[PDB]
Amino acid sequence: THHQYIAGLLIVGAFAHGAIFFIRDYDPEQNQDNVLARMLAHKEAVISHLSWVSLFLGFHTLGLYVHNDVVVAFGNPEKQILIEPIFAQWIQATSGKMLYGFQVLLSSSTSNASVAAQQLWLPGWLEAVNNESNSLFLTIGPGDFLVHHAIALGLHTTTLILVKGALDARGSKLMPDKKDF
Amino acid sequence: MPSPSFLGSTGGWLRCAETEEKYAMTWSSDQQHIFEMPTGGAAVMNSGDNLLYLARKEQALALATQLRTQFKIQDYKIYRIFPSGEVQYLHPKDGVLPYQVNKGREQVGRVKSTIGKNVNPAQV
Ligand SMILES: CC1=C(/C=C/C(C)=C\C=CC(/C)=C/C=C/C=C(C)/C=C/C=C(C)/C=C/C2=C(C)CCCC2(C)C)C(C)(C)CCC1
């Protein structure tokens, strides 16, 4: 979490100085005709998509959460609309397990894709992931998915907030002389 | 000069007011009236001109704005400097600022586009 918080810091520092670059160093007269100047001639469409994502991942992540709490409070945890991240379960299938049997990656040691480069280091791979005592690709399920859904929600919202502040830095409709300060 | 009497202290006997420039207003006051200071309660306005002390410029202009709405009286405000320099900063033209005057001039005026271009081609 130490390096995690400092990672978020460096991200914000990069984007803040990017906004300063657009204010004190950008010039539409020189960078014209490329793709960078073409961005902020139509950037409103990009801001629209990002706002839509921020609303979508909210009404469903937190909406699922409210359903979970309300139906568990009523004494029916089974009526709860549970969720299974089969995409994140596929990561566990990639670990070389040969007992799955539903045409997933690394489910059979005879497949040429699995046979390719399984001569030396794969024996340790399969032995290291087929354990409940290590932290090499843990089990993933509902309480594991819905938080990743929430992380996507918060991170996409954060992305929009960090980008639009640098986009509407020279001016906006509320204030087009923002560059004059 | 006969000035309205006010009680409550607060305004007077401030060191900062003594070391800082002070404002002095006046008004005709053809009739005995009762008004309110911008920083005090109520006080009776005596006949003839009345000189007061003010510590802020906005305080010196809001009182003139309030007097103009009551009755129709010309206002005079004089702004003194720290040592003893007394200059007429209010109505240097003696013509009301919103109304048109003959003595015209331009100070700090850039005549360029509206999005920006903050460079000034000429200060005077
Ligand atoms: C705003 C601003 C700025 C900044 C920006 C930025 C910083 C951005 C970013 C971003 C980011 C931060 C990104 C990231 C990324 C990544 C990517 C984009 C990738 C990719 C791809 C792929 C496809 C992959 C694949 C793979 C491989 C390779 C192997 C393994 C597996 C996988 C799948 C992963 C500037 C200053 C400029 C300007 C102004 C302001």
Side-chain angles (χ1 to χ4, degrees):
Chain A
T1 318
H2 162 257
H3 288 81
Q4 194 60 253
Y5 281 27
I6 309 301
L9 285 185
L10 289 203
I11 292 169
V12 184
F15 292 157
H17 297 95
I20 309 168
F21 164 75
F22 185 68
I23 294 182
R24 300 178 182 267
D25 297 321
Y26 183 78
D27 189 7
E29 297 179 351
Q30 298 181 357
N31 293 117
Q32 193 177 353
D33 300 327
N34 62 12
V35 299
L36 183 62
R38 185 179 298 274
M39 286 294 298
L40 284 92
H42 73 329
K43 55 145 208 52
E44 311 83 16
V46 184
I47 300 301
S48 300
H49 297 84
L50 270 179
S51 57
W52 180 75
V53 175
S54 180
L55 294 171
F56 170 72
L57 298 181
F59 283 106
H60 298 78
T61 297
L62 194 136
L64 260 293
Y65 264 153
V66 179
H67 169 83
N68 301 328
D69 293 322
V70 161
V71 73
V72 167
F74 290 163
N76 288 325
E78 79 286 356
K79 183 193 288 290
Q80 193 196 318
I81 175 176
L82 263 298
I83 190 63
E84 205 73 332
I86 322 131
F87 306 93
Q89 289 185 342
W90 178 69
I91 308 176
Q92 278 60 233
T94 63
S95 298
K97 277 67 173 150
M98 296 180 295
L99 272 305
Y100 220 136
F102 267 18
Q103 281 70 231
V104 292
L105 183 61
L106 265 299
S107 182
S108 179
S109 180
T110 47
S111 181
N112 186 20
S114 62
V115 168
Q118 70 172 4
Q119 47 185 340
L120 294 179
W121 56 97
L122 264 294
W125 182 271
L126 274 67
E127 192 272 340
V129 196
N130 255 310
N131 291 315
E132 296 179 351
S133 60
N134 48 18
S135 62
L136 188 52
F137 288 164
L138 290 76
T139 177
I140 305 176
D144 203 341
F145 160 78
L146 223 156
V147 186
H148 283 97
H149 207 181
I151 291 173
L153 164 63
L155 204 149
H156 292 85
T157 305
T158 305
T159 304
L160 165 62
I161 299 164
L162 264 310
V163 171
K164 187 172 185 172
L167 292 185
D168 284 329
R170 281 176 63 93
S172 66
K173 176 46 56 247
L174 188 70
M175 176 190 181
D177 67 47
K178 191 178 297 183
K179 54 185 179 180
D180 295 334
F181 287 92
Chain B
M1 197 66 68
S3 60
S5 180
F6 177 77
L7 284 73
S9 70
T10 296
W13 282 92
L14 294 177
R15 177 265 165 108
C16 295
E18 297 179 352
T19 186
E20 183 72 23
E21 49 207 0
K22 297 179 71 64
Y23 297 76
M25 299 184 61
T26 183
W27 50 81
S28 179
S29 68
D30 54 354
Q31 185 186 357
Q32 294 288 132
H33 293 297
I34 175 171
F35 69 104
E36 54 178 11
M37 280 70 174
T39 58
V44 50
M45 174 183 296
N46 293 319
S47 179
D49 43 352
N50 304 111
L51 191 148
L52 272 306
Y53 289 166
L54 296 172
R56 276 159 163 153
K57 192 174 185 63
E58 198 181 358
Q59 296 176 354
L61 273 307
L63 196 274
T65 303
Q66 191 273 339
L67 177 71
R68 187 180 61 88
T69 60
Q70 290 184 173
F71 310 140
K72 275 67 60 180
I73 289 106
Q74 54 180 5
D75 49 354
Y76 299 96
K77 182 261 286 175
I78 313 186
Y79 186 3
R80 191 166 172 264
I81 316 295
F82 299 91
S84 60
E86 188 179 358
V87 192
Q88 181 75 33
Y89 280 166
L90 190 264
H91 281 79
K93 310 174 299 183
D94 293 327
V96 268
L97 282 307
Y99 289 77
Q100 187 54 273
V101 300
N102 290 324
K103 295 176 293 298
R105 75 283 290 172
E106 184 70 22
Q107 276 84 6
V108 197
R110 45 100 178 180
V111 278
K112 308 172 70 62
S113 296
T114 307
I115 41 96
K117 274 91 73 171
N118 296 322
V119 291
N120 41 3
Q123 59 177 4
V124 294

